[PDB]
């Protein structure tokens, strides 16, 4: 275990842990609450690099976390979707990918049409599914 501890292991192992990566993603001991505590101008070059790094920290976290909210998966770490898998994406079989490719390799295998999957993802799970209440919310 550890942060990215299973980065080189098979995809089945990264499926098993996963939180250790998600936990250490927003806040860090490195930030350490700023201030010297314990000259009186904090306009130094260091303060500029820190604050612009604290911004992109939450700017990149919220850019990805906004994606989880529009897919109905905000509350959980792994959610299933109602989008069928299209064979043009990969020809490999069920146990052939989860035990032989590792995630590091997999991100390069879908990076071509990865944005296209994201487009179809907002539709089937939250554009129609959240709409389907119309008939079932009350009759």
């Amino acid at each position, epitope marked *: 275990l550890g942060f990215l501890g299973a980065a080189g292991s098979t995809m*089945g192992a990264a499926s098993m842990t996963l939180t250790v990566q998600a936990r250490n993603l927003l806040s860090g001991i490195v930030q350490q609450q700023s201030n010297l505590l314990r000259h009186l101008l904090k306009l130094t070059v260091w303060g500029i690099k820190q604050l612009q790094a604290r911004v992109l920290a939450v700017e990149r976290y919220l850019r990805d976390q906004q994606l989880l909210g529009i897919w109905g998966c905000s509350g959980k770490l792994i959610c299933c979707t109602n989008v069928p898998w299209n064979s043009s994406w990969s020809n490999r079989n069920l*146990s*052939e990918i989860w*035990d*032989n490719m590792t995630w*590091l390799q997999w991100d390069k295998e879908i990076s071509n049409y990865t944005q296209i999957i994201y487009g179809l993802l907002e539709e089937s799970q939250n554009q129609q599914e959240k709409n389907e209440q119309d008939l079932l919310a009350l009759d």
Partner: nanobody
Amino acid sequence: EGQLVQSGAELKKPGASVKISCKTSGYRFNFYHINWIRQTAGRGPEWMGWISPYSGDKNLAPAFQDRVIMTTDTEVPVTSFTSTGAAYMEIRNLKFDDTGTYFCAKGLLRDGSSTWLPYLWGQGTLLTVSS
């Protein structure tokens, strides 16, 4: 995906002994197992043993675990996902019944349900144990 090629044609007198080699490429040599199977003239291909390039735990068949000891060195990376490696196999005391064709083949998968079976096979080596 990478042609594991076996270097062979080495053949000697009965009981002399010999070591065979198989050069790999086109795959992460680190964590796929490598197996050894032969077919003799009296048919019936016989699996010799499997060995893991990581850690090094091996389980060879009981019929050859007293006279066959196989070892293998490390690999040099080419990219993040490919590498080149090689495997060796040592045998001791042989007769005409040990004559035949010998294959080395890459273990199928990197998981726990089934790996000990080969997947991609070497070009094969013809051994002659003739007097």
